[PDB]
């Protein structure tokens, strides 16, 4: 053992050595080695250490803190996904802290129940318009309801013929009241046809 540690005084080599102590089941001592590696190699190689170190030490608050220290890319997301289910929203805030990332959070929030997801999009708005259209429209369909309809107007006005079909649908949805706004919507989409045709 000491004969081996003499090497530690002086990465593949690192993981190998930690695997030695793991074979001897020194456990905690082994985790220390991963402490000594990561102080060296910085956010690049250190990740290569750190992914196995996490998977292992979790397998054995402490690890939570360790990711906390760690955080200063996808690894953060796997890790956060782990922590929430072994506070959840807190994790979603962390992922929030790019389109694919936005898509994920929304999924996990839906897993915590529906209500957040409509909420998530508002965060989402700030190619992305295609995604806000992907979720905002769904929220409008699901639909506070007056704020949601006015939001449907705010989103339809937020920024394409299918989208014209969308605004036309929103106008048509009214029981003889979404006509004027509907014709205005088709007019705006026509204006988009004008700006599009104007393009060289």
């Amino acid at each position: 053992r000491k004969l081996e540690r003499a090497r530690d005084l002086f990465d593949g080599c690192p993981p190998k050595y930690a695997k030695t102590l793991y074979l001897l089941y020194a456990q905690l001592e082994e985790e220390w080695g991963l402490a000594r590696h990561a102080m060296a190699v910085y956010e690049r190689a250190t990740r290569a250490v750190e992914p196995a170190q996490q998977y292992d030490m979790f397998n054995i608050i402490y690890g939570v803190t360790h990711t906390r220290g760690i955080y200063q890319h996808a690894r953060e997301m796997c890790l956060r996904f782990a922590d929430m289910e072994c506070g959840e929203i807190d994790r979603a805030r962390a992922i929030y802290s790019t389109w694919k990332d936005f898509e994920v959070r929304h999924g996990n929030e839906d897993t915590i129940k529906e209500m957040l997801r409509i909420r998530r999009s508002v965060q989402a708005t700030y190619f992305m318009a295609s995604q806000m259209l992907k979720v905002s429209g769904s929220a409008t369909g699901t639909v506070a309801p007056g704020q949601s309809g006015m939001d449907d107007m705010k989103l339809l006005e937020q920024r394409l013929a299918a989208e014209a079909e969308r605004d036309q649908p929103l106008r048509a949805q009214s029981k003889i009241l979404f006509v004027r706004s509907d014709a205005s919507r088709e007019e705006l989409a026509e204006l988009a046809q004008q700006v599009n045709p104007e393009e060289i």
Partner: peptide
């Protein structure tokens, strides 16, 4: 750091 230095 003290918990780290104690590990290594």
């Amino acid at each position: 750091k003290k918990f780290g230095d104690r590990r290594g």
